[PDB]
Design an enzyme around this catalytic site. Sequence first.
Site, short mmCIF file in Angstrom:
data_model
loop_
_atom_site.label_atom_id
_atom_site.label_comp_id
_atom_site.label_asym_id
_atom_site.label_seq_id
_atom_site.Cartn_x
_atom_site.Cartn_y
_atom_site.Cartn_z
N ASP A 25 0.83 -1.20 0.00
CA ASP A 25 0.00 0.00 0.00
C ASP A 25 0.87 1.25 0.00
O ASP A 25 1.28 1.71 1.07
CB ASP A 25 -0.93 -0.02 1.21
CG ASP A 25 -1.96 1.06 1.14
OD1 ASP A 25 -1.91 1.91 0.22
OD2 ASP A 25 -2.85 1.08 2.02
N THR A 26 1.09 1.83 -1.19
CA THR A 26 1.93 3.03 -1.28
C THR A 26 1.26 4.26 -0.68
O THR A 26 1.95 5.24 -0.38
CB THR A 26 2.33 3.31 -2.75
OG1 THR A 26 1.16 3.49 -3.56
CG2 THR A 26 3.14 2.12 -3.32
N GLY A 27 -0.06 4.23 -0.46
CA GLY A 27 -0.75 5.33 0.18
C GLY A 27 -0.73 5.29 1.69
O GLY A 27 -1.30 6.17 2.34
C1 7O7 Z 1 -6.66 6.70 2.92
C2 7O7 Z 1 -5.16 6.66 2.54
C3 7O7 Z 1 -4.64 8.11 2.44
C4 7O7 Z 1 -4.36 5.95 3.68
N1 7O7 Z 1 -4.80 4.55 3.82
C5 7O7 Z 1 -4.11 3.54 2.96
C6 7O7 Z 1 -5.05 3.19 1.79
O1 7O7 Z 1 -4.36 2.46 0.84
C7 7O7 Z 1 -6.25 2.38 2.29
C8 7O7 Z 1 -5.87 0.94 2.61
C9 7O7 Z 1 -7.21 0.26 3.01
C10 7O7 Z 1 -7.88 -0.58 2.13
C11 7O7 Z 1 -9.09 -1.16 2.51
C12 7O7 Z 1 -9.63 -0.89 3.76
C13 7O7 Z 1 -8.95 -0.05 4.64
C14 7O7 Z 1 -7.75 0.54 4.27
N2 7O7 Z 1 -7.21 2.33 1.20
C15 7O7 Z 1 -8.63 2.69 1.34
O2 7O7 Z 1 -9.08 3.18 2.35
O3 7O7 Z 1 -9.42 2.41 0.18
C16 7O7 Z 1 -10.78 2.30 0.48
C17 7O7 Z 1 -11.63 3.26 -0.46
C18 7O7 Z 1 -10.87 3.58 -1.64
O4 7O7 Z 1 -11.36 2.40 -2.94
C19 7O7 Z 1 -11.59 0.91 -2.18
O5 7O7 Z 1 -10.32 0.37 -1.95
C20 7O7 Z 1 -10.16 0.14 -0.40
C21 7O7 Z 1 -11.24 0.96 0.16
C22 7O7 Z 1 -12.26 1.13 -0.91
C23 7O7 Z 1 -12.73 2.54 -0.83
S1 7O7 Z 1 -5.16 4.02 5.43
O6 7O7 Z 1 -5.46 2.59 5.41
O7 7O7 Z 1 -6.21 4.89 5.98
C24 7O7 Z 1 -3.62 4.31 6.35
C25 7O7 Z 1 -2.59 3.38 6.35
C26 7O7 Z 1 -1.41 3.61 7.04
C27 7O7 Z 1 -1.25 4.80 7.74
N3 7O7 Z 1 -0.20 5.16 8.46
C28 7O7 Z 1 -0.30 6.37 9.05
N4 7O7 Z 1 0.74 6.99 9.88
C29 7O7 Z 1 0.51 8.34 10.40
C30 7O7 Z 1 0.80 9.43 9.36
C31 7O7 Z 1 1.80 9.17 10.52
S2 7O7 Z 1 -1.85 7.09 8.68
C32 7O7 Z 1 -2.26 5.73 7.75
C33 7O7 Z 1 -3.45 5.50 7.06
#
Ligand code: 7O7
Lengths: 99, 99
Positions: A25-27
């Site tokens: 997860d690059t995000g």
């Molecule tokens: C939101 C993004 C900016 C950050 N995120 C990573 C995303 O990659 C997340 C991964 C995921 C997938 C599925 C379920 C939950 C989560 N993806 C997501 O939410 O996608 C959603 C929506 C989009 O299209 C569909 O695909 C999946 C679903 C669905 C609808 S994280 O998890 O919030 C996240 C992770 C690590 C992290 N570390 C921090 N440290 C702090 C800073 C010092 S803060 C922090 C926040």
Amino acid sequence: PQITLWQRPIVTIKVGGQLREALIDTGADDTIFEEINLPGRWKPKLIGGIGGFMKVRQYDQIPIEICGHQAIGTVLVGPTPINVIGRNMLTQIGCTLNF
Amino acid sequence: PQITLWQRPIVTIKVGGQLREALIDTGADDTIFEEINLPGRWKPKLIGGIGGFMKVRQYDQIPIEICGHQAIGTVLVGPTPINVIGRNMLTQIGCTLNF
Ligand SMILES: CC(C)CN(C[C@@H](O)[C@H](Cc1ccccc1)NC(=O)O[C@H]1[C@H]2CO[C@H]3OC[C@@H]1[C@H]3C2)S(=O)(=O)c1ccc2nc(NC3CC3)sc2c1
């Protein structure tokens, strides 16, 4: 390896002596697992995502094996919908984006 | 280009005639922007992430330019903390993970 994005980029990992699958997860700045049992002390932490915030336990200096590659770093444990490998670990295994 | 992960992989995009920055996000199925003004019909959608669910507007067949590469696809508009380019667009521009 190279991983395309037609499907979710899920890989097999070993952490805390347990086997799990997780999304590359690059995000994600940090690495988050649901339902693993890690040893030692931890700090409570609140992290933000889509939909709001969630409380996690923060464990430091945790060894992890990610698709065969060794790393060590912070692992957060809490009710994430999917386990995610974030940049704190991806940088250690040499992961890059290419297009 | 190649993008390493020591910093957030943020790129410049053009969508709906507007310029924005967005995170290349392999953990995102879909593409989500906060506060863009897109034309035409949309349908309400609830999507889930870390910390719960959020309401978005779903717009289909929206042209987007991602770091100079053209794509067309679904764009969700809603209160995300950061704009994210998800796999539905990343596959169109040939983006891959490498390690
Ligand atoms: C939101 C993004 C900016 C950050 N995120 C990573 C995303 O990659 C997340 C991964 C995921 C997938 C599925 C379920 C939950 C989560 N993806 C997501 O939410 O996608 C959603 C929506 C989009 O299209 C569909 O695909 C999946 C679903 C669905 C609808 S994280 O998890 O919030 C996240 C992770 C690590 C992290 N570390 C921090 N440290 C702090 C800073 C010092 S803060 C922090 C926040």
